[PDB]
């Protein structure tokens, strides 16, 4: 597939399927935070095209910067303790 997909950390804070954030670190999302937890004003259905919509709010730069801290931040989905950079 032409997407990337890591496994996310047991302490990354996974929730489910959905647009978010995380820090790839030895190719392991060592944090994650999504759309809909940053956002609370969102409506929609995790799509692909919102990363171009909400890839620029305050508090999703926000979010994207805290995890800077760590490691590399991606912007993607996540399903099954997995992550995938969109």
Same mark, same amino acid.
Do not use: H
């Given at each position: 597939?032409?997407?990337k997909? %890591? *496994? =996310? /950390? *047991?302490?990354?804070? %996974?929730? /489910?399927?959905?647009?978010?954030?995380?820090?790839? !670190?030895?190719?392991?999302? =060592?944090? +994650? *935070?999504?759309? $809909?937890? =940053?956002?609370?004003? %969102?409506? /929609?259905?995790? *799509?692909?095209?919102?990363? #171009? $919509?909400?890839?620029?709010?305050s $508090?999703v730069?926000?979010?994207? #910067?805290?995890?800077?801290?760590?490691a590399?931040? !991606? +912007?993607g989905?996540? !399903?099954?303790?997995?992550?995938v950079? #969109?």
């Amino acid at each position: 597939m032409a997407n990337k997909t %890591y *496994k =996310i /950390g *047991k302490n990354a804070g %996974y929730d /489910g399927c959905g647009l978010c954030l995380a820090a790839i !670190s030895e190719n392991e999302a =060592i944090k +994650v *935070k999504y759309l $809909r937890d =940053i956002c609370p004003d %969102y409506d /929609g259905d995790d *799509k692909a095209e919102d990363w #171009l $919509r909400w890839g620029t709010d305050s $508090r999703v730069k926000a979010a994207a #910067l805290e995890m800077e801290q760590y490691a590399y931040t !991606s +912007v993607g989905m996540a !399903s099954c303790w997995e992550f995938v950079e #969109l």
